[PDB]
Amino acid sequence: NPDPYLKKEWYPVIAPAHFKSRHIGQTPVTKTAGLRVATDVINHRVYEVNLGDLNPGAEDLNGNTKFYLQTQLVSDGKCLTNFHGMDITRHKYGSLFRKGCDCIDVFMDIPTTDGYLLRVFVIAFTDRFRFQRRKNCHVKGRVIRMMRAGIYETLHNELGKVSIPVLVTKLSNFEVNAKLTEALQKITMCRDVMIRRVKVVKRPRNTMELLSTMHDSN
Amino acid sequence: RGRGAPLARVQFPNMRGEGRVNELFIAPEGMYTGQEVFSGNKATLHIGNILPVGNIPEGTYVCNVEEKPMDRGCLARASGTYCLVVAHNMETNKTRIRLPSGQKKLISSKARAMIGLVAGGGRTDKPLLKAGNAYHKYKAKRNCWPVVRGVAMNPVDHPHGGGNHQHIGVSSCVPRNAVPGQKVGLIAARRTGCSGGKR
Amino acid sequence: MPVKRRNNGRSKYNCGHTNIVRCQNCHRCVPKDKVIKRFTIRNIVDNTIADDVLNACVIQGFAIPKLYNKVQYCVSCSIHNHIVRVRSREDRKIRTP
Amino acid sequence: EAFAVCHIYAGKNDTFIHVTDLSGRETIGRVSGGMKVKRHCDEPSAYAAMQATQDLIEIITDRGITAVHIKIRADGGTGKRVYGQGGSAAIRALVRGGIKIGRIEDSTPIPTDRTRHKGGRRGRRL
Amino acid sequence: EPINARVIEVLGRTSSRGGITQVKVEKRQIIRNVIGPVRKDDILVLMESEREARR
Amino acid sequence: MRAKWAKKRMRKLKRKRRHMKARS
RNA sequence: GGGACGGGUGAAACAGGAUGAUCCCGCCGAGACCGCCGGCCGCGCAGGCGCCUGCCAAGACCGCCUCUGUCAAUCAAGGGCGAAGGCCGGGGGCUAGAAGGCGAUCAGACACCACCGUAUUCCCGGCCGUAAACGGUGCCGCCCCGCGGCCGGCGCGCGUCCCGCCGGCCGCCCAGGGAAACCGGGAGGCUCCGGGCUCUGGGGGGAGUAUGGCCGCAAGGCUGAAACUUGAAGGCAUUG
Numbered sequence A: 001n002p003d004p005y006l007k008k009e010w011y012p013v014i015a016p017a018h019f020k021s022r023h024i025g026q027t028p029v030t031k032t033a034g035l036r037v038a039t040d041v042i043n044h045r046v047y048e049v050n051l052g053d054l055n056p057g058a059e060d061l062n063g064n065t066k067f068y069l070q071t072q073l074v075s076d077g078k079c080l081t082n083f084h085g086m087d088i089t090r091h092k093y094g095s096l097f098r099k100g101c102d103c104i105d106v107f108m109d110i111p112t113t114d115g116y117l118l119r120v121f122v123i124a125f126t127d128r129f130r131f132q133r134r135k136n137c138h139v140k141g142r143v144i145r146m147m148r149a150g151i152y153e154t155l156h157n158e159l160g161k162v163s164i165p166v167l168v169t170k171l172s173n174f175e176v177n178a179k180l181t182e183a184l185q186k187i188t189m190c191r192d193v194m195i196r197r198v199k200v201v202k203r204p205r206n207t208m209e210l211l212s213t214m215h216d217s218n
Numbered sequence B: 001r002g003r004g005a006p007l008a009r010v011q012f013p014n015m016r017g018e019g020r021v022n023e024l025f026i027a028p029e030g031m032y033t034g035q036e037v038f039s040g041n042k043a044t045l046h047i048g049n050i051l052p053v054g055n056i057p058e059g060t061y062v063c064n065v066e067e068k069p070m071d072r073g074c075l076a077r078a079s080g081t082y083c084l085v086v087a088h089n090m091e092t093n094k095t096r097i098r099l100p101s102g103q104k105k106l107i108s109s110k111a112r113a114m115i116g117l118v119a120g121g122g123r124t125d126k127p128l129l130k131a132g133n134a135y136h137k138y139k140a141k142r143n144c145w146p147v148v149r150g151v152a153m154n155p156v157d158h159p160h161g162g163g164n165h166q167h168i169g170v171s172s173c174v175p176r177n178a179v180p181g182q183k184v185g186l187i188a189a190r191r192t193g194c195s196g197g198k199r
Numbered sequence C: 001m002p003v004k005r006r007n008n009g010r011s012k013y014n015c016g017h018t019n020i021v022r023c024q025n026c027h028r029c030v031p032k033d034k035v036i037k038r039f040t041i042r043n044i045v046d047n048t049i050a051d052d053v054l055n056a057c058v059i060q061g062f063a064i065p066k067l068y069n070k071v072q073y074c075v076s077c078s079i080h081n082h083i084v085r086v087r088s089r090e091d092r093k094i095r096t097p
Numbered sequence D: 001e002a003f004a005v006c007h008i009y010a011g012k013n014d015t016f017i018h019v020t021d022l023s024g025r026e027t028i029g030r031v032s033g034g035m036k037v038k039r040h041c042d043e044p045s046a047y048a049a050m051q052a053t054q055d056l057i058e059i060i061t062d063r064g065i066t067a068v069h070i071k072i073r074a075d076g077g078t079g080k081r082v083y084g085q086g087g088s089a090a091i092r093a094l095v096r097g098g099i100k101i102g103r104i105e106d107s108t109p110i111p112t113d114r115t116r117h118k119g120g121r122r123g124r125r126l
Numbered sequence E: 001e002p003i004n005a006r007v008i009e010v011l012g013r014t015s016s017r018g019g020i021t022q023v024k025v026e027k028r029q030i031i032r033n034v035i036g037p038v039r040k041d042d043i044l045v046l047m048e049s050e051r052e053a054r055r
Numbered sequence F: 001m002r003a004k005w006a007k008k009r010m011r012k013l014k015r016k017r018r019h020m021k022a023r024s
Numbered sequence G: 001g002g003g004a005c006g007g008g009u010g011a012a013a014c015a016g017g018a019u020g021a022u023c024c025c026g027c028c029g030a031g032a033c034c035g036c037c038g039g040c041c042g043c044g045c046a047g048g049c050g051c052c053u054g055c056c057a058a059g060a061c062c063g064c065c066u067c068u069g070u071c072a073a074u075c076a077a078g079g080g081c082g083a084a085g086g087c088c089g090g091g092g093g094c095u096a097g098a099a100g101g102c103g104a105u106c107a108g109a110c111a112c113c114a115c116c117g118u119a120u121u122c123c124c125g126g127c128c129g130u131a132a133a134c135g136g137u138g139c140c141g142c143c144c145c146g147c148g149g150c151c152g153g154c155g156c157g158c159g160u161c162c163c164g165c166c167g168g169c170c171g172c173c174c175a176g177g178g179a180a181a182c183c184g185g186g187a188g189g190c191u192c193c194g195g196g197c198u199c200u201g202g203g204g205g206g207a208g209u210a211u212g213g214c215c216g217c218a219a220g221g222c223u224g225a226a227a228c229u230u231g232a233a234g235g236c237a238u239u240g
């Protein structure tokens, strides 16, 4: 067996202009021979990149958020990635749960104004008022229902008609998290309310305009 | 006569002259005399209507489906049968369907179907009690009944015939390329016997 | 065989039936209000190497991720591995953790 | 400055240390604890894990990698969720083989609900 | 390659039958098992410093 | 015996007696 | 993509792999299940009850200067429900897995442990009617030293708290009870014995068996003896 890396050659991977570290890395591939073109095999790869590795310096605010960036067009021997999904980290998720409080999970399918459809998942936790007798923080159904309705109508206001680049701005910024928290602070004490995941359910086939806007600073 | 499901006589207007035009349809269950049915690219989603399978949403029950456009319908025609619409692929312009056997199949998206499932379902759940009921059923169809077993014959009449005890003698799995006169018994069987646990 | 505990060996108050959990050690079926439960929080690298990882990291301000795992055992496994001990008749009434 | 991903599979019976690129589609290193031992009980051990990581260092360095992000996992599914002994051993030999470290993470497959694990209602009767 | 290192303290007898002795050997605090009699300020010639004693 | 298994034995015996009486 | 072993155990051996496995990553399919949160939390007549959204009829409690006028308690016969396994007819079939097969262990091992696997596990229409179906404690009503905890509703107070009331679920405990263990919201108010109603027992075996009857497709269930035999069986507790 001859060494396969005598026929390798790498390409750059590039991140959307929403970020300050756009060289994600290099990626290998086998050179073109037969029918596989290298630029017709490295396309559609999915990369998994930490937000603190894309906006470095704000590690406390950004290290627990992860992005999925899919290359969607190779030109000039550069790969150009595009929004593919958002998730939080496993230890951040595990640290959320205690015993004594209530956990609320919701999701809804949110369309965008340019052909994308998303599933967005939210989490909230009940919290202890400062001057209360008991240790548990359980609340009644009349309150659970108010919190779920608030999450639904709020996310409807912010994300009801957005495009992908504005969405990515908000998701990198936590712009939505603060107003979920704002709307839901008025009902009870609640500790950590956040979007924890976003899943691209169905996108259009041709994204050449979209990616032109995303990488081209525009 | 000879058919389990019923038929519907349906009248349309003559579209190239004056008068009316008469059609026979395999009847979906729930169709009734005096109903108005619709046929076209813009017909609505109602039991009894004829629509291209491309315009029919995933999850739908259809019957009398064409496997190629315009051939006028050849799939899921027997009483109680239907096809499911599984998925649409627009760029290749194909639709995926489930046939009553459970096989999956790609057809064109301009192939037409009828909304619903075939009426007469449950027919085979009643036992035939008597030789006479089988006699009447097959008298309406074909000269195929009653059936004489091969081992009950002499060797001149059948390859299972003869012997001092009734018995086949060799294996009754025969190959796929056997010639006419030889291709009796179980033809090209992947397996045999009665065991559970399939899926 | 008189009765040994007022709680009959479990915490079931005002119901008929409670869920089933598998034991993690031996995989036996145990009711949820009888299973022995503990919560552990531990780093994914030993602390005898957490210093070397933290010196050899590149990220400025990086922190060691923790782990949050709830262990659940049956009575046999708990006693055998010494999560719980057989106690004196007086000591059995103590609920201090 | 040159980044790849190290999947460390710390199983109950074997150990895997495997290096791919950031996408996962392309592999650069693959060693196992059972390619360095004679007795089948020693593959999940720390001496085997380190001794395999010492060959992995050679492969990855000679192909041109200097830093890795670590993804460490257990068996998962319906079974165990604590690591095998040699996972931290792999981390140790990886730092003391020159490599720079980046993002760290647990990556065990855990279910949201589940099918039924083997062994029966009464468990492994030993 | 011999890797001579120096003990800076005795932790205790390790083997079930007495035997071996945990020591704190040395810019490192590696801990190791030792068979024979060892005081403080003594020397061990180490075939390797890669592993540290369990516990 | 364990009473569970004595019960299984007795049931098999009663089944045998009933089969026996069924002849004639 | 990459190239040598992977699985499994206390340790191993049978299954797997250059027909490139184990490992990484993307995509597709199917049927179960509903984690962390999850509890001296909560609901239901018991059996039981945990994904999202919608729809449908119920329920106990509290609050009340609303209506009626004893319409109630318990109950042979009779009717309904009833974990799991099992049966009949349709469907479905991922996991696990009675039976069956096979690798070890062993004196043997037809067992425990490893591996493969059929019924079964899931749905629809029925049937069967049993569990340490347990609080081993029948239902209605009264009186009852006290200290806490949690759950639902209400009211007074100061400036979330705080004190009370009704109902539920729990801990500890004076008296009293008891063979004791323990109970104590009763197992108390009982040789100082009597509020109402229904069911069951009468030394240990033979025996829940034989026999007859009713029910069930079957598997069974329900009802249920006699001859004969025996000096004990059994409860809670003390020392070794």
Ligand SMILES: [K+]
Residues within 6 Å of the ligand: A141, A142
């Ligand atoms: K409510």
Ligand SMILES: [K+]
Residues within 6 Å of the ligand: A141
């Ligand atoms: K609810």
Ligand SMILES: [K+]
Residues within 6 Å of the ligand: B143, B144, B145, B146
């Ligand atoms: K004939």
Ligand SMILES: [K+]
Residues within 6 Å of the ligand: B147, B148, B149
């Ligand atoms: K015949």
Ligand SMILES: [K+]
Residues within 6 Å of the ligand: B151, B159, B160, B161, B162, B163, B166, B167, B168, B169
């Ligand atoms: K013959």
Ligand SMILES: [K+]
Residues within 6 Å of the ligand: C001, C002
């Ligand atoms: K006893």
Ligand SMILES: [K+]
Residues within 6 Å of the ligand: C008, C009, C010, C034
């Ligand atoms: K118990």
Ligand SMILES: [K+]
Residues within 6 Å of the ligand: C013, C014, G040, G169
């Ligand atoms: K309770």
Ligand SMILES: [K+]
Residues within 6 Å of the ligand: C012, C013, C014, C015
């Ligand atoms: K409860």
Ligand SMILES: [K+]
Residues within 6 Å of the ligand: C015, C017, C018
């Ligand atoms: K419960």
Ligand SMILES: [K+]
Residues within 6 Å of the ligand: C035, C036, C037, C038
């Ligand atoms: K516990």
Ligand SMILES: [K+]
Residues within 6 Å of the ligand: C074, C075, C076, C077
């Ligand atoms: K146990």
Ligand SMILES: [K+]
Residues within 6 Å of the ligand: D034, D035, D037, D038, D039, D040
């Ligand atoms: K080996």
Ligand SMILES: [K+]
Residues within 6 Å of the ligand: D077, D078, D111, D113, D114, D115, D116
């Ligand atoms: K599962």
Ligand SMILES: [K+]
Residues within 6 Å of the ligand: D118
């Ligand atoms: K299995």
Ligand SMILES: [K+]
Residues within 6 Å of the ligand: D119, D120, D122, D123, D124, D125
């Ligand atoms: K078992």
